Structure 1
Amino acid sequence: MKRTFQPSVLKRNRSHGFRARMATKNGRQVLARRRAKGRARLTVSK
């Protein structure tokens, strides 16, 4: 059975990486919320 998570680092970074979050207003909102909560890892990049 082929499961849903098929890892790929390039796709991971392009979809959820830091520069993808910083590219839009809503992504920057995501970053702001995660900074406010105190997350140790903002994005998948780390």
Structure 2
Amino acid sequence: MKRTFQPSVLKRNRSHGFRARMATKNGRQVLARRRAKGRARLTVSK
């Protein structure tokens, strides 16, 4: 029946968006961790 994935641009962003993952310590630590690992797209490109 109903699936487990009801999209919503806004949510998808503020939930795992740059600023968001940039408004907290670890969250911000995350990005770094990513850039370090050398990832193409950082967080939900757009």
For normalisation by structure 2, the TM-score amounts to: 0.91
Total equivalences in the alignment = 46
**Aligned partner of residue 3 in structure 1, secondary structure:** coil
Identity in percent: 100
The 5-angstrom pairing of residues 29-44 of structure 1 reads 29-44=29-44
Deviations 1:7-36 (A, max 9, x none): 000000110000100000011111011000
Off by >2 Å, runs of 4+ in structure 1: none
RMSD value over aligned CA atoms? Answer: 0.9
For normalisation by structure 1, the TM-score amounts to: 0.91
